[PDB]
Design a binder for these strands. Structure first.
Lengths: 144, 144, 144, 144, 144, 144, 144
RNA sequence: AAAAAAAAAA
RNA sequence: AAAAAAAAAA
RNA sequence: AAAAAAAAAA
RNA sequence: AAAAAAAAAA
RNA sequence: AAAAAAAAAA
RNA sequence: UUUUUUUUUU
RNA sequence: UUUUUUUUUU
RNA sequence: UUUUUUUUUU
RNA sequence: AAAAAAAAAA
RNA sequence: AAAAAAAAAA
RNA sequence: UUUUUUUUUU
RNA sequence: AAAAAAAAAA
RNA sequence: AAAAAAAAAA
RNA sequence: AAAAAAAAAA
RNA sequence: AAAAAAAAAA
RNA sequence: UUUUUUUUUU
RNA sequence: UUUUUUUUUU
């Protein structure tokens, strides 16, 4: 392949965008209490730890949850997800349980195209329920 | 297609990365004096206006320049580019001229694979010469 | 086929959901006055008569209306539907008339994918106008 | 695809049903004592927690059991299932055992077509035996 | 072809709609100040000058902009667009610049299907920035 | 498909039209007396109830008529149409009768290409005769 | 398929057998001491708990062994099997060891066709050795 | 036959 | 790949 | 048509 | 060649 | 697609 | 993708 | 007979 | 190996 | 393989 | 040759 | 889906 | 698809 | 399958 | 024939 | 074309 | 022999 | 990709 700089025959000035969109998967954790549902805020996706402090809106595509800490004694890990939306919250409780006490419990859900609108920091993604004190999330989204 | 949320049978916790790389084309402008060469610093690529204030290094792939203002009276626009490298500056003067007085002049150059190392904010990209007082650049690079 | 019980060789604990979604066609009637449009509330879909008193939101896909009672003397039955949306009500008046005085008049409309968001009990499906005193509806939707 | 509402050319009033059937897999847990068989009541399937409080009968198709808590010390988890029927109870003890002490034990059985009749709340599904104090069940059935 | 009136063998009365939908491209201009962003109201699309004064909602599909006046002295024409949405404003700045000082600058963006909801007169389409005092807009939309 | 806004690489300013044409079918009713022909005015097609109050001319392609009320006692429904033209009125009497006393009568005619000129509000479409007091008309026309 | 009873045109009285053979895999456990071989008696296969109390002889085809309890501290589980025969005992010590301290150790041996004679309750099947205090056996055999 | 630099071409 | 329920389709 | 980044898939 | 609007058709 | 110069190659 | 100049490899 | 949702089997 | 986003080449 | 009765089906 | 139960197998 | 055992049908 | 009336055509 | 309206495309 | 939801399957 | 009942047949 | 108008058959 | 349940289209 080429070993030195080569000339580019550029033409007219193209169309540019200094602030483009970005498809990303954001990993973060949430602290949950026993028997209490925790509304996960959308504002947790806008942070300098994800290079996403420049955005103000995001389109969430899918949500995946993992238990982050060990379950109580004699129990297996479980994590539930209840989707939330601005036009109307859902009543599904997608639950995944671990079959080994030393293994995480995982579950997720996909958001259909008809409900993939923008969300801002004040909004909530879903509700999380678990017997472990911490839940890790991996949210596939498009920042715009 | 689907009209409601559907469960995702997630498995083990996957390999994640909260601060990934990003291939971009960064547009920005510089002020140039007549008969004086302007050194374009690499620090101009790290800004919040480009969503890039979180990176510290960047791999430049190609540089393109356009004249941003009108040329002096009776003249046609022109722009020269001299590539600069930490291992050793080059002496090429890639020059493009305008064939219409009302049209921009443009030129660009490609950096070969053997010279695509990282550069930090303190480094320089190239030298810019032009008869117009402002030059527009679009630098294709990989942030990491 | 099998005549007695057979053993299932199960494995790990699967991903479960106790409150799943449900695509339905909900029949119900509304009383209409002469020359006055009636806003059909979405809350009519959540009732124990439909096994749907557990849902809080619903995604309406298509609405079909029939005249339920006989028209006034010397007239043929008719029914008009005007779709309503939270992001902006429409002005279309889909209308159907009966060609026999003793037959029902019917009409319906389809909701596109871009407008298939969730609606709650406080929302309205559409406006209905009819010279008959009652109108039967069959609203294809997805409860979630 | 369409971006606005389109008219449906509906015809006569169709055959309707406001309370239809539903095939579901219902997850719930039962408390088991050591060396004592526990009868699983059919009434545990009718609940507002499963959106099935509107049904009174149910046709059971298959039953799957998992150990929900840890086994006693030094032991591996096990679970036994004995199908119960109104016309005549079976004596099969379908058993599954865990090969890892930290993993659930699971087993299941399928009800043939000749035994798929309706059952009410008073009826029993099966007897469960386990060295663990809790057993999670997932019953595939059709509500009607 | 036929040179006189011929009889149509019509049948039953069909499904009619007096106020139908309408796919349109609405051209109009806005006044922009130097260095000041201008929010384009959706109400600009409802006017008797476009035959659309009878509509109350509209679904936008794409937005296009051209510079309507000459840029300041020594400068090339440019125009920036930032899409706005009720669910969440975007941060993109789609920019197009003129390569000839006598030529307009043009740029545009397309709204995805998942963001094509209804918008009323009080809503805003996008922000516009330009060094020219007037920008010509052409908005492909569906009236309903 | 796309989930976020994407940039359109627009070019020169295109040919636009703010007040375009429109192919429509305009449904409306007229009051007819027994044994008296009624001239249908073209001005009935220009109204805000049809979104066509902005037009001043219209080109008719075909005319259809149904009886809107019940016929007198012991009689079957009928309707006659006589096309009218500015260059010369026709003498045809396209007639359709009901085979059931409870059913509407329908008939229609098509205007050839050589007679499809513009018509203003002062002009008349056709004469209508019927034993019923009201006749429903559906006129396929092109507004311009 | 047939929904009521049908007539069977039987012929002569067939050859019957009220006490037929039966191929089975008998699950049972034995208690084993440390460093002491345990002779598993054939009489353990004849029991009402396996529906085989009516048999007096059995033809053993294969023997499989699993550890039933946890091994000593710091040790992995293991189990040995030594086949025994009335015509002459074997000296093979088929051994299996667990590769996880929390998993069962398993091994098995198949009896060839030339050594598949009948064995009564007084006979032995194999000698079992293990560091666990219990071994779970599953013996494939034909009861006759 | 492919690859690099300088030049040329549709 | 076939079958059941709920929904949609030619 | 190939390659790079991010995402998604069998 | 495909997608959306209005009209028409088997 | 061919030709020249500098370089690399089977 | 090829022709030519410098160079290399085989 | 297929698309889609819940679920199961492989 | 393809689809999608950013970008370049042609 | 055809025919009859009763039932079910495209 | 297909269906069932029990066992076994790739 | 097959091999084996018990039984049935043809 | 053929025939009849009026018209038009190679 | 063809014709008209509005939108889009090579 | 394709798509959706609930279930079942290799 | 398949399935049920009664009848009939190789 | 076809196209068009009126009309009938299917 | 198919079978079943609700439903739609043809």
């Amino acid at each position: 392949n080429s070993n030195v700089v080569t000339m580019i025959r550029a033409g007219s000035y193209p169309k540019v965008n200094p602030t483009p969109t970005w498809v990303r998967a954001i990993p973060f954790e949430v602290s949950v209490q026993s028997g209490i549902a925790f509304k996960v805020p959308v504002g947790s996706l806008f942070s300098a730890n994800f290079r996403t402090d420049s955005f103000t809106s995001v389109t969430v595509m899918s949500v995946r949850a993992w238990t982050q800490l060990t379950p109580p004694v004699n129990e297996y890990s479980f994590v539930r997800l209840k989707p939330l939306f601005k036009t109307g919250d859902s009543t599904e409780e997608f639950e995944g349980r671990a079959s080994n006490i030393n293994t995480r419990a995982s579950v997720g859900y996909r958001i259909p195209t008809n409900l993939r609108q923008n969300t801002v920091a004040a909004d909530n993604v879903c509700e999380v329920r678990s017997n472990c004190r911490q839940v890790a999330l991996v949210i596939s989204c498009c920042f715009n």
